[PDB]
Amino acid sequence: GSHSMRYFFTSVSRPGRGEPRFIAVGYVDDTQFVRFDSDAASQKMEPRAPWIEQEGPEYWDQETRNMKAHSQTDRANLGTLRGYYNQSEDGSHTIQIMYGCDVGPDGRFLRGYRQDAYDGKDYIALNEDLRSWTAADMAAQITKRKWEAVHAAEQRRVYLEGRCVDGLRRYLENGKETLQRTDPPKTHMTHHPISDHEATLRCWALGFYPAEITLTWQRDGEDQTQDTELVETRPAGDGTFQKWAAVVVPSGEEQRYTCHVQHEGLPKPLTLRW
């Protein structure tokens, strides 16, 4: 299947309370593999997946340099944006950045991304063509003009089509025993009387990977979409995911209902009946 690598960065100003908090995380697909935290003791990029630990000292040194540089740029940028917007020094502000690339099953480049936000709203984004920018407001237009003058877009494209792709490809091979696996959901149904005349049926999917899954309820074969409560997909804490769907049914009618579970790790979709 297709794969992705993403880095997510958050810097938050802390007026009166020292330097901004900087937190960086890297992902391959739904799996986190590196982190940097400015308040942590190491002051290094750190491994968060087994398969990255075998990268040598020069990898860790370089990634650490990259994080310090990102940190420092964000710090100056918090000041810059505060000036563009005429904001009070008293307020806490946030810069977030995401970038990364997607590859197909043959490792070929599908698309790249680079997007910046200020205080949780779009600020400036690289367009899909990897040659132009979308600025969200008048302040971001200043940045757009600057990044045009310094040919930032070409620099991003070089990264996104090159090292982003090369890195992801190496990671997918090195961590193939986990990144290229699919853990099918462990499924079961539970039953919870609400009264003598009603019960909840809950259809569970646990321990699955990757995160994408569909759970659907039927009554006599017909989808019950509107009546179905679906929780948001949630991390188990061990690298796998969880989800459930529930329906409220008339007591005595539980056996008319079925739950269908679809996941790429299943030989065939599963059907459950009380």
């Binding site: 997510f8 986190q32 982190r35 949780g120 709203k121 949630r234 804490g237």
Partner: protein, 100 residues
């Protein structure tokens, strides 16, 4: 800037089995700004050791975090997650229910 209030789910890593060691999770998502207060409680009392995932965010720029602790559920012990955030007037408590 617009602020967004956290969504909260409290649950266990594994289906609960009384007397068997497990992990208690509190997954907070869809919030902004990132500053947040998340404690895990046993019988109304703050659990001492709680850790959390590395701050990340979704497509709409809102943040998410997993907070967790080892626990050994029983019939009688009550667990909860207590969340405060700038958007909440006062802390919000969500009881752990082994059926959700």
């Amino acid at each position: 800037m617009i602020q967004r209030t956290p969504k909260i789910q409290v649950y266990s890593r594994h289906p609960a089995e009384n007397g068997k060691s497990n992990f208690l999770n509190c997954y907070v998502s869809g919030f902004h700004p990132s500053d947040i207060e998340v404690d895990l409680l046993k019988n109304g009392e703050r659990i001492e050791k709680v850790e959390h995932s590395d701050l990340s965010f979704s497509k709409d720029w809102s943040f998410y975090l997993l907070y967790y602790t080892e626990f050994t559920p029983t019939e009688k012990d009550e667990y909860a997650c207590r969340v405060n955030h700038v958007t909440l007037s006062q802390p919000k408590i969500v009881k752990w229910d082994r059926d959700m």
